[PDB]
Ligand binder design. Structure first.
Ligand SMILES: *C(=O)[C@H](CC=C)[C@H]1CCC[C@@H]1O
Length: 241
């Protein structure tokens, strides 16, 4: 996250680290959200069928084995069937990962709540992106979970040709776009968290893409997969695997 700050420890208890095996080291590559005791939600672009995956849960520092943090092997990968890696701007950038065994819920490890089907956030809605990605474009990755505040930019604005133009579809969410705060490489797959009308935190987006001009860029909002578009698919995959 560029332009953000350290999260409070364990305050985003659904946030996952998605890691792969790199030459006998476990290496962070994407974020994710725990969405059921057996399933993590993430971005399809984070998945290669050739890598091997584990998920780390209940974490704050990526390098410290903190008490009550947990690594679990990932055993099944389910990418959205309409995802095309060669057409990232079509959307459908979504994947569900099955854990080898269910996690027990705790104070540090909780489920992230999804919005109703079809829910659209209005312009300037307040949300927060979280992750262990880069702190600036091509710069450092933190050890500690960051968060950053991002306001929703609605479709009508974000599709303008000064913004993303036609890169952006109604199956995505735009947030940010001031050039101060953004997601960045390494935040991919993790949550856009927005608090619903009754206090509750919900995960509305999955970090998908930013601009080749830079992670933080005026009138290039960070783009997210819109979770309220796949509620039905998420539940089918879970019932059927
Ligand atoms: C994820 O962190 C990145 C988007 C965030 C702004 C992805 C861009 C391509 C590589 C990475 O997976």
């Amino acid at each position: 996250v560029v332009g953000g700050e350290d999260a409070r420890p364990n305050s985003w208890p659904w946030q996952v680290s998605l890691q792969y095996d790199s030459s006998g080291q476990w290496r962070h590559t994407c974020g994710g959200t725990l969405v059921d005791q057996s399933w993590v939600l993430t971005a399809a672009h984070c998945i290669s069928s050739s890598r091997t995956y584990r998920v780390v849960l209940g974490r704050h520092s990526l390098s410290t084995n903190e008490p009550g943090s947990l690594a679990v092997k990932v055993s099944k990968l389910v990418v959205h069937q309409d995802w095309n890696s060669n057409q990232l701007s079509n959307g459908n950038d979504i994947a569900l990962l099955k854990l080898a065994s269910p996690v027990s819920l705790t104070d540090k490890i909780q489920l992230g709540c999804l919005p109703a089907a079809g829910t659209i956030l209005p312009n300037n809605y307040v949300c927060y992106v979280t992750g262990w990605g880069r702190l600036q474009t091509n710069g450092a990755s933190p050890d500690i979970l960051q968060q950053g505040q991002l306001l929703v930019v609605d479709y009508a604005t974000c599709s303008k040709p000064g913004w993303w133009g036609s890169t952006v579809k109604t199956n995505m969410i735009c947030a940010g776009g001031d050039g101060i705060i953004s997601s960045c490489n390494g935040d991919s797959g993790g949550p856009l968290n927005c608090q619903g009308a009754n206090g509750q935190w919900q995960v509305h987006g999955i970090v998908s893409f930013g601009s080749s001009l830079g992670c933080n860029y005026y009138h290039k909002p960070s783009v997210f997969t819109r979770v309220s578009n796949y509620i039905d698919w998420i539940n089918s995959v879970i019932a059927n695997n």
